[PDB]
Amino acid sequence: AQYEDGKQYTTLEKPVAGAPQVLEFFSFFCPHCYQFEEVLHISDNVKKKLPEGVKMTKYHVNFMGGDLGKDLTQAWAVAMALGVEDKVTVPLFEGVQKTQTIRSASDIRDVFINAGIKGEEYDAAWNSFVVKSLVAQQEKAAADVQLRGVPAMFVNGKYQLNPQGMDTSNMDVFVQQYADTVKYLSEK
Ligand SMILES: CCN(CCn1cccn1)C(=O)Cc1ccc(Oc2ccc(C#N)c(C)c2)cc1
Incomplete structure (x- = not known):
C-alpha cells in the first residue's frame, strides 16, 4: 500500500478513546518544533487539508x-x-x-x-x-x-505520525506528504 503502518505513521499498542481528532505535542525547547512552526508551518498546512471546523489541539x-x-x-x-x-x-x-x-x-x-x-x-x-x-x-x-519525544501528532488517539519515514530533500514536499498523511488517517 502507498500508506503503510511503520512508514508514514505508526499505530499505538493501546488506543486512547475520546482523544482529540488531531492532537499535536510540542515544546519551545524542541528544535524540530521550531522548524515545524516558523519554517514549515505544519499545523496550518494540516488544518488546510482537513475539513472545515475539525478540531485541532496543540499541547506543550x-x-x-x-x-x-x-x-x-x-x-x-x-x-x-x-x-x-x-x-x-x-x-x-x-x-x-x-x-x-x-x-x-x-x-x-x-x-x-x-x-x-x-x-x-x-x-x-x-x-x-x-x-x-x-x-x-x-x-x-x-x-x-x-x-x-516531540514534535508528535496523533490522529483520533490511534495513529502517530512518522515524519522520519517521509522525504526531507524538499521542505515543501515534506509538508505536503505530512498533511496528506494526516488527511488519510483522518478518513480511516
Ligand atoms: C520525537 C522524535 N524526535 C525527537 C528526537 N530527535 C531529534 C532529532 C531527531 N530525532 C524528532 O524530532 C522526530 C523528528 C521529526 C521530524 C523530522 O523531520 C524533519 C524535521 C525538520 C525538518 C525541517 N526543516 C524537516 C524537513 C524534516 C525528523 C525527526
Whole structure:
C-alpha cells in the first residue's frame, strides 16, 4: 500500500478513546518544533487539508527544559485560555532558542506583555484554576500515549505520525506528504 503502518505513521499498542481528532505535542525547547512552526508551518498546512471546523489541539510538554519547561506549559495554558496562541508562539520560540532571552517565568511574562496582554490579565490567568485544569489536560494527554519525544501528532488517539519515514530533500514536499498523511488517517 502507498500508506503503510511503520512508514508514514505508526499505530499505538493501546488506543486512547475520546482523544482529540488531531492532537499535536510540542515544546519551545524542541528544535524540530521550531522548524515545524516558523519554517514549515505544519499545523496550518494540516488544518488546510482537513475539513472545515475539525478540531485541532496543540499541547506543550514538560520533559524538556526542567523548571522553565514546566513554566512554559503553564504559560501555554495561559495562551490557550486567553486565545492568544497566534501572538506568543513565535516570540516564545525565538526567546528560548534564537535570542535565548527567556530564562525565567518573568521573561515568559514579558513576551505576553510585549504581545499586548495586560499584566493583570496575564497574572490572573496564570493563577487561575481554569489554567490549572488546562495544565492537567496537557499532562493527561501526553501521559495517555507515554510521550517521550516531540514534535508528535496523533490522529483520533490511534495513529502517530512518522515524519522520519517521509522525504526531507524538499521542505515543501515534506509538508505536503505530512498533511496528506494526516488527511488519510483522518478518513480511516
Ligand atoms: C520525537 C522524535 N524526535 C525527537 C528526537 N530527535 C531529534 C532529532 C531527531 N530525532 C524528532 O524530532 C522526530 C523528528 C521529526 C521530524 C523530522 O523531520 C524533519 C524535521 C525538520 C525538518 C525541517 N526543516 C524537516 C524537513 C524534516 C525528523 C525527526
